[PDB]
Design an enzyme around this catalytic site. Structure first.
Site, PDB file in Angstrom:
ATOM      1  N   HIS A  40       0.803  -1.217   0.000  1.00 25.49           N
ATOM      2  CA  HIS A  40       0.000   0.000   0.000  1.00 25.49           C
ATOM      3  C   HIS A  40       0.840   1.274   0.000  1.00 25.49           C
ATOM      4  O   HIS A  40       0.283   2.370  -0.029  1.00 25.49           O
ATOM      5  CB  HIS A  40      -0.987  -0.088   1.166  1.00 25.49           C
ATOM      6  CG  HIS A  40      -2.301  -0.681   0.749  1.00 25.49           C
ATOM      7  ND1 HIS A  40      -2.397  -1.958   0.221  1.00 25.49           N
ATOM      8  CD2 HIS A  40      -3.572  -0.219   0.848  1.00 25.49           C
ATOM      9  CE1 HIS A  40      -3.660  -2.226  -0.060  1.00 25.49           C
ATOM     10  NE2 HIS A  40      -4.396  -1.195   0.330  1.00 25.49           N
ATOM     11  N   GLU A  71       0.148  -8.031   0.718  1.00 28.44           N
ATOM     12  CA  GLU A  71       0.621  -6.746   1.248  1.00 28.44           C
ATOM     13  C   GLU A  71       2.134  -6.569   1.194  1.00 28.44           C
ATOM     14  O   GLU A  71       2.655  -5.586   1.765  1.00 28.44           O
ATOM     15  CB  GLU A  71       0.127  -6.535   2.679  1.00 28.44           C
ATOM     16  CG  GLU A  71       0.037  -5.059   3.202  1.00 28.44           C
ATOM     17  CD  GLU A  71      -0.423  -4.027   2.157  1.00 28.44           C
ATOM     18  OE1 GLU A  71      -1.177  -4.374   1.192  1.00 28.44           O
ATOM     19  OE2 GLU A  71      -0.036  -2.849   2.337  1.00 28.44           O
ATOM     20  N   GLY A 145       2.991   5.621  10.771  1.00 27.95           N
ATOM     21  CA  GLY A 145       4.377   5.868  10.465  1.00 27.95           C
ATOM     22  C   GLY A 145       5.278   4.692  10.694  1.00 27.95           C
ATOM     23  O   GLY A 145       6.468   4.773  10.361  1.00 27.95           O
ATOM     24  N   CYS A 147       4.642   1.568   9.373  1.00 24.39           N
ATOM     25  CA  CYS A 147       4.538   0.527   8.333  1.00 24.39           C
ATOM     26  C   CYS A 147       5.872   0.324   7.606  1.00 24.39           C
ATOM     27  O   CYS A 147       6.652   1.262   7.393  1.00 24.39           O
ATOM     28  CB  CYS A 147       3.409   0.851   7.360  1.00 24.39           C
ATOM     29  SG  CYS A 147       1.781   0.655   8.142  1.00 24.39           S
TER      30      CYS A 147
HETATM   31  C1  LIG Z   1       1.349   2.306   8.612  1.00 25.55           C
HETATM   32  C2  LIG Z   1       1.259   3.107   7.321  1.00 25.55           C
HETATM   33  C3  LIG Z   1       2.483   3.998   7.304  1.00 25.55           C
HETATM   34  O1  LIG Z   1       3.390   3.871   8.120  1.00 25.55           O
HETATM   35  O2  LIG Z   1       2.473   4.893   6.291  1.00 25.55           O
HETATM   36  C4  LIG Z   1       3.721   5.598   6.022  1.00 25.55           C
HETATM   37  C5  LIG Z   1       3.433   6.657   4.992  1.00 25.55           C
HETATM   38  C6  LIG Z   1       0.008   2.251   9.325  1.00 25.55           C
HETATM   39  C7  LIG Z   1       0.079   1.508  10.665  1.00 25.55           C
HETATM   40  C8  LIG Z   1      -1.247   1.540  11.476  1.00 25.55           C
HETATM   41  C9  LIG Z   1      -1.912   2.911  11.794  1.00 25.55           C
HETATM   42  C10 LIG Z   1      -2.468   2.759  13.219  1.00 25.55           C
HETATM   43  N1  LIG Z   1      -1.756   1.605  13.748  1.00 25.55           N
HETATM   44  C11 LIG Z   1      -1.045   0.885  12.863  1.00 25.55           C
HETATM   45  O3  LIG Z   1      -0.395  -0.107  13.147  1.00 25.55           O
HETATM   46  N2  LIG Z   1      -0.913   1.574   8.434  1.00 25.55           N
HETATM   47  C12 LIG Z   1      -2.159   2.031   8.203  1.00 25.55           C
HETATM   48  O4  LIG Z   1      -2.698   3.030   8.656  1.00 25.55           O
HETATM   49  C13 LIG Z   1      -2.908   1.077   7.270  1.00 25.55           C
HETATM   50  C14 LIG Z   1      -2.339   1.094   5.863  1.00 25.55           C
HETATM   51  C15 LIG Z   1      -3.079   0.171   5.000  1.00 25.55           C
HETATM   52  C16 LIG Z   1      -3.701  -0.592   4.312  1.00 25.55           C
HETATM   53  N3  LIG Z   1      -4.362   1.096   7.455  1.00 25.55           N
HETATM   54  C17 LIG Z   1      -5.229   1.806   6.706  1.00 25.55           C
HETATM   55  C18 LIG Z   1      -6.560   1.669   6.942  1.00 25.55           C
HETATM   56  C19 LIG Z   1      -7.052   0.793   7.948  1.00 25.55           C
HETATM   57  C20 LIG Z   1      -6.168   0.089   8.709  1.00 25.55           C
HETATM   58  N4  LIG Z   1      -6.449  -0.829   9.712  1.00 25.55           N
HETATM   59  C21 LIG Z   1      -7.314  -1.863   9.550  1.00 25.55           C
HETATM   60  O5  LIG Z   1      -7.905  -2.094   8.497  1.00 25.55           O
HETATM   61  C22 LIG Z   1      -7.411  -2.791  10.717  1.00 25.55           C
HETATM   62  C23 LIG Z   1      -8.286  -3.900  10.870  1.00 25.55           C
HETATM   63  C24 LIG Z   1      -7.923  -4.428  12.068  1.00 25.55           C
HETATM   64  C25 LIG Z   1      -8.410  -5.573  12.864  1.00 25.55           C
HETATM   65  O6  LIG Z   1      -6.892  -3.716  12.614  1.00 25.55           O
HETATM   66  N5  LIG Z   1      -6.561  -2.691  11.727  1.00 25.55           N
HETATM   67  C26 LIG Z   1      -4.742   0.211   8.467  1.00 25.55           C
HETATM   68  O7  LIG Z   1      -3.892  -0.417   9.133  1.00 25.55           O
HETATM   69 NA    NA Z   2       3.965   9.979  11.292  1.00 20.23          NA
END
Ligand SMILES: *[C@@H](CC(=O)OCC)[C@H](C[C@@H]1CCNC1=O)NC(=O)[C@H](CC#C)n1cccc(NC(=O)c2cc(C)on2)c1=O
Ligand code: NA
Ligand code: NA
Ligand code: NA
Ligand code: NA
Ligand code: NA
Ligand code: NA
Ligand code: NA
Ligand code: NA
Ligand code: NA
Ligand code: NA
Length: 187
Positions: A40, A71, A145, A147
């Site tokens: 993503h 992913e 942040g 990921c």
């Molecule tokens: C990392 C993305 C990042 O670092 O971007 C850099 C530019 C984050 C990590 C998440 C945010 C809150 N806690 C974490 O561990 N990833 C996201 O925000 C992701 C990316 C994708 C796809 N994201 C987006 C939308 C929804 C969710 N979460 C879920 O769908 C979900 C379902 C269950 C159960 O738990 N989470 C998501 O992680």
């Molecule tokens: Na951040």
């Protein structure tokens, strides 16, 4: 105890800061000029590595035989340095794990380590509305942040962080057979 020493040596030699149109991600280098990044992140033709614009020579967004997102995107970069070959640290099979470390390398967080505790083979996750398979779970409030963050136990690099909801965190598995040397039109 968590394997802090192992996580550190992986981060020293095998991580870089990757920046796409989606923002900055920790990026694990696996061998030669081949690395991984959450799918993503939307890798394109070029990518910034440590703020250096770099040609993306190949990019494979992994999916399983059910045609479901894994992913993980594998990239091949036009850079002069080779990554230390860490394929032998990769798990051969799916597995559950004890007392793992999550490590981040971004501009904001150049060197940070989070013990996430136990890691279980979760399987299916609806990740931000995308069905996804082969997911590892930890009960830890991971955050924006992080990921691409590398998930290790001692002696094994088991996956990279791909999402979470403020209560649990999730990584995409890394399997040794993803990086073995092998004619197939894949684009
Ligand atoms: C990392 C993305 C990042 O670092 O971007 C850099 C530019 C984050 C990590 C998440 C945010 C809150 N806690 C974490 O561990 N990833 C996201 O925000 C992701 C990316 C994708 C796809 N994201 C987006 C939308 C929804 C969710 N979460 C879920 O769908 C979900 C379902 C269950 C159960 O738990 N989470 C998501 O992680
Ligand atoms: Na951040
Ligand atoms: Na940015
Ligand atoms: Na590839
Ligand atoms: Na093996
Ligand atoms: Na900065
Ligand atoms: Na469930
Ligand atoms: Na969503
Ligand atoms: Na919960
Ligand atoms: Na091989
Ligand atoms: Na190998």
């Amino acid at each position: 105890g968590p394997g802090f020493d192992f996580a550190q040596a992986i981060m020293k030699k095998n991580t870089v800061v990757a920046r796409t149109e989606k923002g900055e991600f920790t990026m694990l280098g696996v061998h030669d000029r081949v690395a991984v990044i959450p799918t993503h992140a939307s890798v394109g033709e070029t990518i910034y590595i440590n703020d250096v614009e770099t040609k993306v020579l190949d990019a494979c967004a992994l999916r399983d035989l059910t045609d479901t997102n894994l992913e993980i995107t594998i990239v091949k970069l036009d850079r002069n340095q080779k990554f230390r070959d860490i394929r032998h640290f990769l798990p051969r099979y799916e597995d559950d794990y004890n007392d793992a470390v999550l490590s981040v390398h971004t501009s904001k967080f150049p060197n940070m380590y989070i013990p996430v505790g136990q890691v279980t083979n979760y399987g299916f996750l609806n990740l931000g509305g995308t069905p996804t398979h082969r997911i590892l779970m930890y009960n830890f409030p991971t955050r924006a942040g992080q990921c691409g963050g590398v998930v290790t136990t001692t002696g094994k690099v088991i996956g990279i962080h791909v999402g979470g909801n403020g209560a649990q965190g999730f990584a995409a598995m890394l399997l040794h057979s993803y990086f073995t040397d092998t004619r197939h039109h894949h684009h």
